[PDB]
């Protein structure tokens, strides 16, 4: 899998819609997934409407949308892929905290896309870049493009465990917000400020925003136990 639109024909196996124009000009990328639209490929002109708030994330100004993206842009597809992890095998739901911990500590090997909506409904799937290697996971949370490294997540979890192994009252070394919205997101808490060594503080201050967002779900007083998410592509196909 190479493009976000590749999930349609590879895990949803949906044939293209009808009434679609056929490109008969010089190739140009899809305005959504940057996929080339060569001669003979089925496309459709852009008709996003006045409620499209993702003009900044458009891959190109070609005003053309491939059929895979047209399938992806359906309301049933948007709602189904709000908290979805699309691997080669199928589509899983990472909405639960345990699923997030499993994904960010024991990721699947194959290429996969990670989606997470920050609101009721958002355009995600055609914006998420593919994660080619599980060591450098690219996560699209709403409008933010996050890079999550599972090794850094594990190291931060170990740092917290060493910090709070003895004290009965568990305290978060770093202030984290699940929405990545608080003005104190990523700042060191007091307990971590005078209970962590210089190296651990330096490591905590030098984590990517995506790692802070992930730890905002995985790092708590009682760490969630990782579990495999349930397959969802059947539900999405049935509702489509």
Q: Which residues bind Zn ion (CB under 5 A)?
A: 5, 30, 32-33, 35, 66, 69
- The closest alpha carbon to 191, from 210, 225, 168, belongs to 168
- The closest alpha carbon to 211, from 173, 168, 164, 154, belongs to 154
For helices 209-218 and 150-163, the axis angle rounded to 10 degrees is 50
Of 140 and 149, nearer to Zn ion (C-beta) is: 140
Q: Which of DNA, Zn ion, none lies near 118, with the C-beta cut-off 5 to 8 A by kind?
A: DNA
Q: Which of DNA, Zn ion, none lies near 206, with the C-beta cut-off 5 to 8 A by kind?
A: none
Question: Shortest approach of Zn ion to residue 26 CB, angstroms?
Answer: 17
**What is the C-alpha to C-alpha distance for residues 131 and 111, in angstroms, rounded to an integer?**
5
Do β-strands 64-66 and 42-45 pair in parallel, antiparallel, or remain unpaired?
antiparallel
- The closest alpha carbon to 68, from 121, 110, 113, 107, belongs to 113
* Position 145 contacts DNA (CB under 7 A): no
Stretch that binds DNA, among 68-76, 92-100, 153-161, 225-233 (CB under 7 A): 68-76
Strand runs labelled E in the chain: 21-22, 28-29, 36-37, 42-45, 64-66, 84-86, 91-93, 113-116, 137-141, 144-148
For helices 209-218 and 97-105, the axis angle rounded to 10 degrees is 130
Of 6 and 211, nearer to Zn ion (C-beta) is: 6
Q: Which of DNA, Zn ion, none lies near 66, with the C-beta cut-off 5 to 8 A by kind?
A: Zn ion
Of 42 and 48, nearer to DNA (C-beta) is: 48
* Position 206 contacts DNA (CB under 7 A): no
30 known ligand binder: yes
125 known ligand binder: no
Question: Shortest approach of DNA to residue 128 CB, angstroms?
Answer: 15
**What is the C-alpha to C-alpha distance for residues 91 and 77, in angstroms, rounded to an integer?**
12
Binding to DNA (CB under 7 A) within 105-124 occurs at 118-123
Binding to DNA (CB under 7 A) within 31-50 occurs at 48-49
231 known ligand binder: no
Binding annotation: 30, 33, 66, 69
């Amino acid at each position: 899998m190479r493009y976000p639109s590749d999930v349609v024909d590879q895990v949803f196996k949906l044939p293209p819609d009808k009434g679609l124009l056929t490109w008969d000009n010089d190739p140009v990328a899809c305005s959504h997934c940057a996929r080339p639209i060569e001669k003979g490929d089925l496309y459709s002109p852009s008709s996003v409407g006045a409620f499209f708030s993702d003009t900044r994330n458009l891959a190109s100004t070609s005003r053309s949308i491939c059929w895979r993206c047209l399938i992806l842009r359906k309301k049933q597809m948007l709602n189904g892929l709000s908290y979805a992890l699309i691997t080669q095998d199928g589509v899983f739901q990472i909405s639960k905290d345990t699923n997030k911990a499993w994904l960010f500590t024991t990721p699947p090997p194959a290429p996969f896309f990670v989606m997470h909506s920050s609101s009721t409904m958002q355009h995600l799937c055609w914006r998420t870049p593919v994660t080619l290697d599980n060591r450098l996971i690219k996560v699209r949370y709403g409008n933010n493009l996050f890079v999550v490294r599972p090794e850094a997540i594990r190291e931060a979890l170990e740092i917290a465990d060493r910090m709070n192994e003895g004290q009965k009252k568990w305290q978060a070394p770093i202030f984290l917000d699940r929405k990545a919205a608080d003005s104190g997101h990523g700042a060191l808490t007091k307990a971590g400020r005078e209970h962590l060594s210089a190296a651990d503080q330096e490591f905590l201050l030098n984590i990517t925003p995506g790692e802070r967002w992930a730890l905002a779900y995985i790092m708590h007083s009682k760490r969630p136990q990782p579990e495999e998410p349930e397959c969802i592509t059947s539900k999405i196909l049935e509702k489509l």
